[PDB]
């Protein structure tokens, strides 16, 4: 038994929920929350921008220091950092951007990352200013994700549109 409330179950380990997954993050302090990072670590828009701003941008100054370290991460990779006041860990997600002509087949490697941790709270990896078609998104989540992941989709409109078209 776990903290989530009000998710609609799509698989054995696959939820979702129509959710600002700032909000979500604030209310129930999970593990885990993904950010839909880019390899620079870059928070500058989309759930990147927005979950950074809720830490007063302490996300992006502890991002900074990573980067100087340890270069970029690879699209399709990932890092765990702090989650601030928002959860215990983030786990900084390179979901492949097609507004820059990245290899879609790179998403399911992307969501692979999330089998690394039992429990997650996440978006749909490059959906949004990613570029990504979102029904597609949840389907290689369902299909490569085997923890337990709780799905955050901003808006209403997609939601509905995600859930009835879920096969
Ligand atoms: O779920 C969606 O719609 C898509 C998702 N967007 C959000 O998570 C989101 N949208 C709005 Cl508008 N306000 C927000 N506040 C806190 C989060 C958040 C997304 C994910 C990756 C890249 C780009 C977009």
């Given at each position: 038994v ?13 939820y ?25 670590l ?44 928002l959860?215990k ?45 979102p ?18 989709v ?14």
């Open positions: 776990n903290s989530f409330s009000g998710y609609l179950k799509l698989t054995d380990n696959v979702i929920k129509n959710a600002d997954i700032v909000e979500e993050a604030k209310k129930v302090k999970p593990t885990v929350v993904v950010n839909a990072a880019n390899v620079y870059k928070h500058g828009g989309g759930v990147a921008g927005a979950l950074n701003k809720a830490t007063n941008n302490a996300m992006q100054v502890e991002s900074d220091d990573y980067i100087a370290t340890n270069g970029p991460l690879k699209v399709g990779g990932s890092c765990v950092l702090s989650g601030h006041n959860a860990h983030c786990l900084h997600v390179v979901g492949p951007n097609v507004n820059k002509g990245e290899d879609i087949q790179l998403l399911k490697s992307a969501y692979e990352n999330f089998n690394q941790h039992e429990v997650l709270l996440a978006p749909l990896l490059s959906a949004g200013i990613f570029g990504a078609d029904i597609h998104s949840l389907r290689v989540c369902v299909d490569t994700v085997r923890t337990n992941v709780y799905l955050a901003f808006d209403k409109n997609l939601y509905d549109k995600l859930v009835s078209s879920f096969l």
